[PDB]
Scaffold this active site. Structure first.
Site, PDB file in Angstrom:
ATOM      1  N   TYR A 509     -10.913  -6.314  -7.662  1.00  0.00           N
ATOM      2  CA  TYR A 509     -10.159  -5.155  -7.171  1.00  0.00           C
ATOM      3  C   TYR A 509      -8.711  -5.607  -6.996  1.00  0.00           C
ATOM      4  O   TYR A 509      -7.860  -5.212  -7.781  1.00  0.00           O
ATOM      5  CB  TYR A 509     -10.744  -4.581  -5.889  1.00  0.00           C
ATOM      6  CG  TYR A 509     -10.001  -3.380  -5.336  1.00  0.00           C
ATOM      7  CD1 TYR A 509     -10.398  -2.078  -5.644  1.00  0.00           C
ATOM      8  CD2 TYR A 509      -8.915  -3.550  -4.487  1.00  0.00           C
ATOM      9  CE1 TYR A 509      -9.714  -0.970  -5.123  1.00  0.00           C
ATOM     10  CE2 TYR A 509      -8.237  -2.490  -3.968  1.00  0.00           C
ATOM     11  CZ  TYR A 509      -8.633  -1.192  -4.277  1.00  0.00           C
ATOM     12  OH  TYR A 509      -7.930  -0.134  -3.728  1.00  0.00           O
ATOM     13  N   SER A 592     -10.419   1.285 -10.300  1.00  0.00           N
ATOM     14  CA  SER A 592      -9.212   1.698  -9.557  1.00  0.00           C
ATOM     15  C   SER A 592      -8.069   0.688  -9.696  1.00  0.00           C
ATOM     16  O   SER A 592      -7.710   0.353 -10.829  1.00  0.00           O
ATOM     17  CB  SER A 592      -9.525   1.996  -8.105  1.00  0.00           C
ATOM     18  OG  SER A 592      -9.125   3.312  -7.800  1.00  0.00           O
ATOM     19  N   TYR A 593      -7.483   0.190  -8.597  1.00  0.00           N
ATOM     20  CA  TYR A 593      -6.587  -0.980  -8.729  1.00  0.00           C
ATOM     21  C   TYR A 593      -7.354  -1.992  -9.579  1.00  0.00           C
ATOM     22  O   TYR A 593      -6.794  -2.707 -10.381  1.00  0.00           O
ATOM     23  CB  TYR A 593      -6.168  -1.600  -7.376  1.00  0.00           C
ATOM     24  CG  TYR A 593      -4.887  -2.414  -7.459  1.00  0.00           C
ATOM     25  CD1 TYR A 593      -4.840  -3.610  -8.195  1.00  0.00           C
ATOM     26  CD2 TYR A 593      -3.723  -1.985  -6.841  1.00  0.00           C
ATOM     27  CE1 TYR A 593      -3.643  -4.384  -8.310  1.00  0.00           C
ATOM     28  CE2 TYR A 593      -2.522  -2.735  -6.942  1.00  0.00           C
ATOM     29  CZ  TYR A 593      -2.493  -3.921  -7.689  1.00  0.00           C
ATOM     30  OH  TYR A 593      -1.335  -4.630  -7.821  1.00  0.00           O
ATOM     31  N   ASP A 670     -10.800  13.636 -11.839  1.00  0.00           N
ATOM     32  CA  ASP A 670     -10.098  12.690 -10.970  1.00  0.00           C
ATOM     33  C   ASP A 670      -8.749  13.160 -10.411  1.00  0.00           C
ATOM     34  O   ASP A 670      -7.744  13.107 -11.093  1.00  0.00           O
ATOM     35  CB  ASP A 670      -9.852  11.421 -11.788  1.00  0.00           C
ATOM     36  CG  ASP A 670      -9.605  10.201 -10.933  1.00  0.00           C
ATOM     37  OD1 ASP A 670      -8.882  10.294  -9.903  1.00  0.00           O
ATOM     38  OD2 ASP A 670     -10.089   9.101 -11.239  1.00  0.00           O
ATOM     39  N   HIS A 702     -12.868  10.773  -8.632  1.00  0.00           N
ATOM     40  CA  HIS A 702     -12.429   9.382  -8.707  1.00  0.00           C
ATOM     41  C   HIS A 702     -13.569   8.389  -8.578  1.00  0.00           C
ATOM     42  O   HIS A 702     -13.521   7.316  -9.165  1.00  0.00           O
ATOM     43  CB  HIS A 702     -11.302   9.030  -7.724  1.00  0.00           C
ATOM     44  CG  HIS A 702     -10.689   7.682  -7.979  1.00  0.00           C
ATOM     45  ND1 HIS A 702     -10.384   7.226  -9.247  1.00  0.00           N
ATOM     46  CD2 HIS A 702     -10.343   6.681  -7.130  1.00  0.00           C
ATOM     47  CE1 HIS A 702      -9.858   6.015  -9.163  1.00  0.00           C
ATOM     48  NE2 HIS A 702      -9.829   5.660  -7.891  1.00  0.00           N
TER      49      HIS A 702
HETATM   50  N1  FPB Z   1      -4.914   5.591  -2.361  1.00  0.00           N
HETATM   51  C1  FPB Z   1      -5.408   4.305  -1.874  1.00  0.00           C
HETATM   52  C2  FPB Z   1      -5.836   4.483  -0.429  1.00  0.00           C
HETATM   53  C3  FPB Z   1      -6.038   3.111   0.189  1.00  0.00           C
HETATM   54  O1  FPB Z   1      -6.155   2.142  -0.534  1.00  0.00           O
HETATM   55  N2  FPB Z   1      -6.068   2.985   1.567  1.00  0.00           N
HETATM   56  C4  FPB Z   1      -5.937   4.117   2.509  1.00  0.00           C
HETATM   57  C5  FPB Z   1      -5.849   3.495   3.910  1.00  0.00           C
HETATM   58  C6  FPB Z   1      -5.520   2.032   3.621  1.00  0.00           C
HETATM   59  C7  FPB Z   1      -6.274   1.745   2.324  1.00  0.00           C
HETATM   60  C8  FPB Z   1      -7.802   1.604   2.549  1.00  0.00           C
HETATM   61  N3  FPB Z   1      -8.442   1.300   1.246  1.00  0.00           N
HETATM   62  C9  FPB Z   1      -9.186   2.225   0.498  1.00  0.00           C
HETATM   63  O2  FPB Z   1      -9.340   3.361   0.920  1.00  0.00           O
HETATM   64  C10 FPB Z   1      -9.775   1.847  -0.822  1.00  0.00           C
HETATM   65  C11 FPB Z   1      -9.907   2.812  -1.833  1.00  0.00           C
HETATM   66  C12 FPB Z   1     -10.439   2.497  -3.083  1.00  0.00           C
HETATM   67  C13 FPB Z   1     -10.844   1.195  -3.338  1.00  0.00           C
HETATM   68  C14 FPB Z   1     -10.716   0.221  -2.340  1.00  0.00           C
HETATM   69  C15 FPB Z   1     -10.183   0.532  -1.086  1.00  0.00           C
HETATM   70  C16 FPB Z   1      -6.665   3.940  -2.647  1.00  0.00           C
HETATM   71  C17 FPB Z   1      -6.251   3.484  -4.026  1.00  0.00           C
HETATM   72  C18 FPB Z   1      -5.556   2.305  -4.182  1.00  0.00           C
HETATM   73  C19 FPB Z   1      -5.174   1.898  -5.448  1.00  0.00           C
HETATM   74  C20 FPB Z   1      -5.471   2.657  -6.562  1.00  0.00           C
HETATM   75  C21 FPB Z   1      -6.164   3.842  -6.411  1.00  0.00           C
HETATM   76  C22 FPB Z   1      -6.543   4.254  -5.144  1.00  0.00           C
HETATM   77  F1  FPB Z   1      -7.200   5.379  -5.007  1.00  0.00           F
END
Ligand code: FPB
Ligand code: NAG
Ligand code: NAG
Ligand code: NAG
Ligand code: NAG
Length: 728
Positions: A509, A592-593, A670, A702
């Protein structure tokens, strides 16, 4: 052990993890549902009794999705027609049912297609949002009062977040905050007028002659942002003759200067709110302390109380500035701050005063503040054995910062190196909750001498099911790169025989602050390639990763797609220089990332990888949302950071894709990472001549989370990998 963890076992979920989701309703009692009834529990004695039977609602006439009992315990809220919007949001139809009087409510029901509902934290008040408008409801069966009238689909939002503030800020649909009293209701309104629209087709069912267009106010990097606005309404002062006078608490002067966001709201007392703001450049943020003027009905935020929070190495706070925890009296608080050394620690703040005083320190981070009494501050950290992918619960002595007791370290050292916790009101008691590397453990403890009352759940059952399967084993370790340590994990085939070459899959990731190497016990796909398809699933945390200090978490500042990709590869490099890895059969898959790093690491032209899969990947950063991106990249302009917005696209590496077998996948619907990202990926590949494999997933969003599509994709990713690694 005969059978293996079967691909349909992950899919159809033949091995279920027991949890222990309880619900405190005072300092010494919680709810938990055995089978389908709702039992309440005494925490200091374990004795329970049935609060509501499983059979109470057998003639309700609607599928019940979720409940919510009120504090006084006099009313239950029932959720049906649950219809899903984004990552957290939805509409639902509701009903209220009186458990004193033994019947359903008919006077003025909550309206259908309601977007958010919540009880006051005391007694039985109601607030909720319908068509972007906030309504309160002193009594469940009297007429609700109307708090705002600005509501307007896709444009004005009252007490609910527009799309970026759902995903990127609050990870929540709600924009509502009660006063511990219940007395005040605090809330935001964001304006999406000038926010551009992301557009796509939703094909719906076959019956649908012409496909639908979904349009969504979604600001991409650089674009016009939603503005915000903050108010607080006195609720023990409403009335049906007059309408409601929200008070507006205006942002600080150093924010009103250019674009900014609300990023935190944390009530501090019956009469004092705490909020942070954060400039649209997010290395700078302001905390503001505001009290009710009894006599004026106003709120004031004196500059004396204002607290700045900067970063010169990158952005502020992990994904955002930390929540504050206040002492009963409100005059002071505790909050995680990056220290002088760049390691994140619990600093202490006195409301009126300059600076703050640190009370933790060391090469390791505090994870979160968890609870606060007049003696102790309770928190979660990864100190134990310099193990960053680990978690224990700790206590600090308020009168002597030197006395620090580990609370979870020695409970079950071999099974349990990864806890979260849940405290009761006032912190009289707590649930420790253990997720690995052994099976889950839910135990109950009393904070008086930290006695060990009771075992709630121990997954006994799961256990002996699993003994009958050739489960895989897990490996937490590190490798040194410069002479810095970077940890990784591997999922290892049963009867791992280290004298055989095993084909190897790199599951990434790898975005700012992420952590894929840890001690959590998971049953997923990785668990199946391993025990059934004897394949090693490796994961690794390089630069840009989290919980190991800011030099590592900030190396990727402004340079997304750089070191985080770089390291991933040298790691694979080191992995194949191991005697049990078949260097002819190395893969990488990410989501995703994940799928962007993957794609990057795949057009790198390193020679290490033979093939990979990319699910739902970003591709060019200008294509993604402003809040998240701009935190990291800044602004896509020449006088700022267009240089590496342009330098870092999956697209510009088309020509290196001829060395590998690419399998890319995305859902048509998505709303998060738009099909676009992938489509641009394929156009480029087609345009420079490379062959590759693809799969759209119509209407899937997504997470591609619909049972059949879920099944369908893991099924597809699986045939690809087997064929990549010449697997039978
Ligand atoms: N928009 C971010 C939200 C996020 O990462 N957040 C929001 C609060 C802090 C952090 C928490 N992490 C996640 O929600 C998350 C989401 C997807 C994969 C792993 C972690 C999720 C995201 C990032 C990169 C690429 C696409 C993608 F959808
Ligand atoms: C109540 O107050 C609001 C002012 O924001 C107004 O828009 C609404 O129409 C008012 N209704 C009446 C008639 O009192
Ligand atoms: C637990 O035991 C005490 C002693 O009888 C009783 O008064 C209390 O109501 C019981 N409550 C529950 C949760 O069963
Ligand atoms: C909610 O919608 C249902 C189904 O259309 C309808 O029967 C019910 O009366 C509605 N309730 C309210 C309060 O609008
Ligand atoms: C939203 O902002 C626009 C300007 O961007 C303004 O014209 C409009 O009235 C605002 N809506 C409200 C009610 O704040």
């Amino acid at each position: 052990s005969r059978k293996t963890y079967t691909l349909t076992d992950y899919l159809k979920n033949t091995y279920r993890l027991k949890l222990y989701s309880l619900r405190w309703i005072s300092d010494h009692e919680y709810l938990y549902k055995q089978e389908n009834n709702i039992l309440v529990f005494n925490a200091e004695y374990g004795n329970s009794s049935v609060f509501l039977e499983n059979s109470t609602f057998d003639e309700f006439g609607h599928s019940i999705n979720d409940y919510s009992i009120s504090p006084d315990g006099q009313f239950i809220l029932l959720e049906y027609n649950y219809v899903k919007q984004w990552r957290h949001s939805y509409t639902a139809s509701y009903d209220i049912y009186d458990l004193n009087k033994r019947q359903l409510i008919t006077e003025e029901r909550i309206p259908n297609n309601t977007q958010w509902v919540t009880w006051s934290p005391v007694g039985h008040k109601l607030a909720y949002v319908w068509n972007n408008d906030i309504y309160v409801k002193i009594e469940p069966n009297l007429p609700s009062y109307r708090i705002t009238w600005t509501g307007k689909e896709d444009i004005i939002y009252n007490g609910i977040t527009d799309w970026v503030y759902e995903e990127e800020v609050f990870s929540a649909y709600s924009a509502l905050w009660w006063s511990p009293n219940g007395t005040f209701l605090a809330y935001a309104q964001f304006n999406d007028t000038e926010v551009p629209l992301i557009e796509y087709s939703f094909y719906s069912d076959e019956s649908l002659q012409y496909p639908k267009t979904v349009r969504v106010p979604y600001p991409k990097a650089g674009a016009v942002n939603p503005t915000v606005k903050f108010f607080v309404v006195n609720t023990d002062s409403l009335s049906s003759v007059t309408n409601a006078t929200s008070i507006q608490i205006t942002a600080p002067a150093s924010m009103l200067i250019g674009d900014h966001y609300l990023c935190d709201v944390t009530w501090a007392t019956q009469e004092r709110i705490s909020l942070q703001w954060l400039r649209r450049i997010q290395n700078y943020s302001v905390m503001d302390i505001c009290d009710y003027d009894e006599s004026s009905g106003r709120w004031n935020c004196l500059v004396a109380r204002q607290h700045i929070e900067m970063s010169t190495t990158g952005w502020v706070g992990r994904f955002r500035p930390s929540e504050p925890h206040f002492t009963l009296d409100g005059n002071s608080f505790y909050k995680i701050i990056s220290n002088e050394e760049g390691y994140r620690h619990i600093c202490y703040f006195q409301i009126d005063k300059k600076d703050c005083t640190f009370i933790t320190k060391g090469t390791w981070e505090v994870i979160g503040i968890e609870a606060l009494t007049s003696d102790y501050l309770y928190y979660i950290s990864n100190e134990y054995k310099g193990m960053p992918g680990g978690r224990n619960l700790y206590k600090i002595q308020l009168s002597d910062y030197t006395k620090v007791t580990c609370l979870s370290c020695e409970l079950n050292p071999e099974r349990c190196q990864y806890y979260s916790v849940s405290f009761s009101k006032e912190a009289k008691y707590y649930q420790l909750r253990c997720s690995g590397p052994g099976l889950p453990l839910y135990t109950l403890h009393s904070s008086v001498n930290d006695k060990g009352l009771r075992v709630l759940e121990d997954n006994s059952a799961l256990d002996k099911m699993l003994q009958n399967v050739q489960m895989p084993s897990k490996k937490l370790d590190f490798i040194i790169l410069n002479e810095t340590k970077f940890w990784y994990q591997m999922i290892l085939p049963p009867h791992f025989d280290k004298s055989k070459k095993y084909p190897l899959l790199l599951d990434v990731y790898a975005g700012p602050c992420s952590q894929k190497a840890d001690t959590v016990f998971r049953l997923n796909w990785a668990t199946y390639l391993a025990s059934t398809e004897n394949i090693i699933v490796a994961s690794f945390d390089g630069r840009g990763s989290g919980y190991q200090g800011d030099k590592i978490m900030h190396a990727i500042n402004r340079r997304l797609g750089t070191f985080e990709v770089e390291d991933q590869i040298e790691a694979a490099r080191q992995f194949s220089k191991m005697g049990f890895v078949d260097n002819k059969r190395i893969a990488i898959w990410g989501w995703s990332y994940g799928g962007y790093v993957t794609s990057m690491v795949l057009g790198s032209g390193s020679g290490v990888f033979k093939c990979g899969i990319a699910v739902a990947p970003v591709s060019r950063w200008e294509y993604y949302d402003s809040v998240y991106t701009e935190r990291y990249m800044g602004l896509p302009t020449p006088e700022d950071n267009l240089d590496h917005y342009r330098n870092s696209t999956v697209m510009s590496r088309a020509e290196n894709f001829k060395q590998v077998e690419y399998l890319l996948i995305h859902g048509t619907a998505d709303d998060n990472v738009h099909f676009q990202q992938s489509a641009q990926i394929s156009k480029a590949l087609v345009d420079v001549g490379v062959d590759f494999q693809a799969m759209w997933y119509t209407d899937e969003d997504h997470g591609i989370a619909s049972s059949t599509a879920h099944q369908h994709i893991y099924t597809h990713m699986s045939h690809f990998i087997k064929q990549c690694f010449s697997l039978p």
